[PDB]
Amino acid sequence: QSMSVKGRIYSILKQIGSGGSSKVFQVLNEKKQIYAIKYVNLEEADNQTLDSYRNEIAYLNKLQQHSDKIIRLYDYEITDQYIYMVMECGNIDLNSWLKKKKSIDPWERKSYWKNMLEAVHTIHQHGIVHSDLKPANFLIVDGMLKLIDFGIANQMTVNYMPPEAIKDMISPKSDVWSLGCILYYMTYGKTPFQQIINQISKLHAIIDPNHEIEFPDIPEKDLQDVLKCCLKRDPKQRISIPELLAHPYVQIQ
Numbered sequence: 001q002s003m004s005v006k007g008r009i010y011s012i013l014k015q016i017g018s019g020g021s022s023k024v025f026q027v028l029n030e031k032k033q034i035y036a037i038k039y040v041n042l043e044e045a046d047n048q049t050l051d052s053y054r055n056e057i058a059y060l061n062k063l064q065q066h067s068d069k070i071i072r073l074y075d076y077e078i079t080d081q082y083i084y085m086v087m088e089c090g091n092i093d094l095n096s097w098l099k100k101k102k103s104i105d106p107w108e109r110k111s112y113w114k115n116m117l118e119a120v121h122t123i124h125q126h127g128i129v130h131s132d133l134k135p136a137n138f139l140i141v142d143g144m145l146k147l148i149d150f151g152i153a154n155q156m157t158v159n160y161m162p163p164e165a166i167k168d169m170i171s172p173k174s175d176v177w178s179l180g181c182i183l184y185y186m187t188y189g190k191t192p193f194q195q196i197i198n199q200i201s202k203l204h205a206i207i208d209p210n211h212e213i214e215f216p217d218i219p220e221k222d223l224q225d226v227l228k229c230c231l232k233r234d235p236k237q238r239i240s241i242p243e244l245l246a247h248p249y250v251q252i253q
C-alpha cells in the first residue's frame with residue numbers, strides 16, 4: 001500500500017491509529033526516511049468541520065517556527081475529498097507509555113513536565129486554549145515530549161476536566177488544571193479523582209471544595225507544591241504557565 005503527497009511517494013508500514021473521519025499511518029519516503037501521515041476523508045465533512053480542520057492545520061504550520069515541542073508538519077495535501085498531513089514519527093504517546101510504565105524516573109518526569117509547559121505555553125502565546133488536555137495529546141519524540149493537537153480539530157475521559165468547565169453548565173488556567181492532573185498521574189500513579197467510578201459523582205467531586213484532594217508526602221517537596229498550585233479549584237487562585245516556568249521544580253535539579 002502506497003500514497004502520494006505533493007509529488008513525493010510514501011510506502012505504508014502500518015496504521016498508528018484511526019479516529020472517526022481520519023487515519024494515521026507509519027510511512028516511508030523514497031530515501032527510506034520514516035514519517036507519520038494523517039489521512040482525513042472529507043466526503044462527509046460539513047463547513048464548520050472543514051473550517052475547524054483548516055484552522056488546526058494553519059496553527060500547526062505557524063507554530064512550527066515558535067517551538068520544537070510542537071510536532072513537525074513537513075508537508076500537506078488538501079483537496080475537497082481529503083487531507084494528507086506529512087508529520088514526524090513519534091515513538092509512542094504519553095498515555096500509552098504511562099499505561100506500560102508503572103514506575104517513572106523523577107528526572108524523566110521533570111523533563112516531560114518542562115516540555116508540556118513549553119508546548120502549552122506556545123499555544124497560549126497565540127491565544128489558543130486547548131481545553132481538553134490529555135496524556136494522549138503528547139508524543140514522545142527522541143525522549144522529548146511534543147504536543148500533537150490544539151483542541152480545535154477535536155469535536156469533529158473526564159479525569160483531567162477543570163472545575164470551571166463543569167460549574168459553567170475557560171482560560172489559559174483551565175489547561176493548568178489538566179496539566180496538573182497529568183503530573184499528578186505521573187507522581188501518584190492515579191489522577192486526582194480516578195477513585196470515583198460513578199461519572200456523575202466524579203463531576204460533583206471535581207466542583208466540590210469540601211472534597212479535599214490528597215497530596216501524600218513525597219521526597220520532592222517542590223513537585224508537591226507544583227501539584228497543590230495547579231489543582232486549585234478557583235482559577236483566580238490557580239498558578240499560571242509563565243509562573244510554573246519559573247517554579248523551582250522546573251528550574252532546579
Ligand SMILES: CN(C)C(=O)c1ccc(Nc2cc3c(cn2)cc(-c2cnco2)n3C(=O)OC(C)(C)C)c(Cl)c1
Pocket residue numbers: 016017018024026036038071087088089090091092093096136139148149
Ligand atoms: C499504541 N500507540 C498508538 C503507539 O504505540 C504509538 C503512538 C504514536 C506513534 N507515533 C506517532 C503518532 C502520531 C504522530 C506521529 N507519530 C502524529 C500524530 C497526529 C495525529 N494528529 C496530529 O498528529 N499521531 C497520532 O495521532 O498518534 C496517535 C493516534 C497515537 C495519537 C506511534 Cl508510531 C505508535
